[PDB]
Design a binder for this molecule. Structure first.
Ligand SMILES: CC(=O)N(C)c1cccnc1
Length: 93
């Protein structure tokens, strides 16, 4: 059975106006801004932007890749696919 989400988990993350997007649950660095309660720090592959989202917007990568892991016109999307598939745990500083 599923656990709760944890840092390092790989997902497709959905925001209003954008396709399901390759992403990871980030850690919070010591001394860094924490998210609101009930929200996770989401790092989006390709764009390298962060947002705070709840589970309703988070689709586990393994289960969803066949639906969602297809090239897309949007800026950074295809880079994002390479990253989630090829080095999803790296520093994208
Ligand atoms: C892919 C991407 O970067 N998206 C969807 C985003 C992330 C954070 C804020 N707005 C949009």
């Amino acid at each position: 059975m599923p656990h709760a989400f944890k840092p390092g988990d790989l997902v497709f993350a959905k925001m209003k106006g954008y396709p399901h997007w390759p992403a990871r649950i980030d850690d919070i660095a010591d001394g860094a801004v924490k998210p609101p309660p009930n929200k996770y720090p989401i790092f989006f592959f390709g764009t390298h932007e962060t947002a705070f989202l709840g589970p309703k917007d988070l689709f586990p990568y393994d289960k969803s890749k066949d639906k969602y892991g297809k090239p897309n016109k949007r800026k950074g999307f295809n880079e994002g696919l390479w990253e989630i598939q090829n080095n999803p745990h790296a520093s994208y500083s």
